[PDB]
């Protein structure tokens, strides 16, 4: 962000961000997945606060 | 001596079943809004 060309981050990022892993390794690829909400509740006691 | 006692037995019945309805339903709001304190679990911190 700001007064900098986009070209010449290009050219920055194909200079020195290039193959940076590229490879999984393992063919393993961490996905995420959806939580579970609770309603809960949780309740620390310190009186002397 | 009782003229009463047909219907007595009668509203007797329908309490019998009205109550073996409504006693597991209402032990069933009981058990809900204090299930919220029977599964409660205490920890304690002390700092040492």
């Known amino acids: 962000?700001?007064?900098?060309?986009?070209?010449q981050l290009l050219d920055l990022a194909q200079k020195h961000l290039s193959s940076v892993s590229r490879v999984y390794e393992e063919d393993a690829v961490?996905?995420?997945?959806?939580?579970?909400?609770?309603?809960?509740?949780?309740?620390?006691?310190?009186?002397?606060? | 001596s009782e003229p009463?006692?047909?219907?007595?037995?009668?509203?007797?019945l329908k309490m019998l079943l009205m109550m073996g309805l409504l006693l597991p339903?209402?032990?069933?709001?009981?058990?809900?809004?204090?299930?919220?304190?029977?599964?409660?679990?205490?920890?304690y911190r002390p700092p040492k």
Not at chain 1, 30 to 49: K, M, N, V
Not at chain 2, 32 to 38: D, F, I, T, Y
Request: hydrophobic share 30%; net charge positive; proline share 4%.
């Open chain 1, 1 to 7: 962000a700001g007064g900098v060309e986009h070209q």
């Open chain 2, 25 to 43: 339903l209402t032990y069933a709001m009981k058990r809900h809004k204090w299930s919220v304190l029977k599964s409660r679990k205490l920890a």
């Open chain 2, 4 to 12: 009463e006692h047909d219907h007595r037995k009668r509203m007797g």
């Open chain 1, 30 to 49: 961490p996905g995420l997945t959806p939580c579970r909400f609770t309603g809960s509740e949780i309740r620390h006691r310190d009186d002397a606060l």
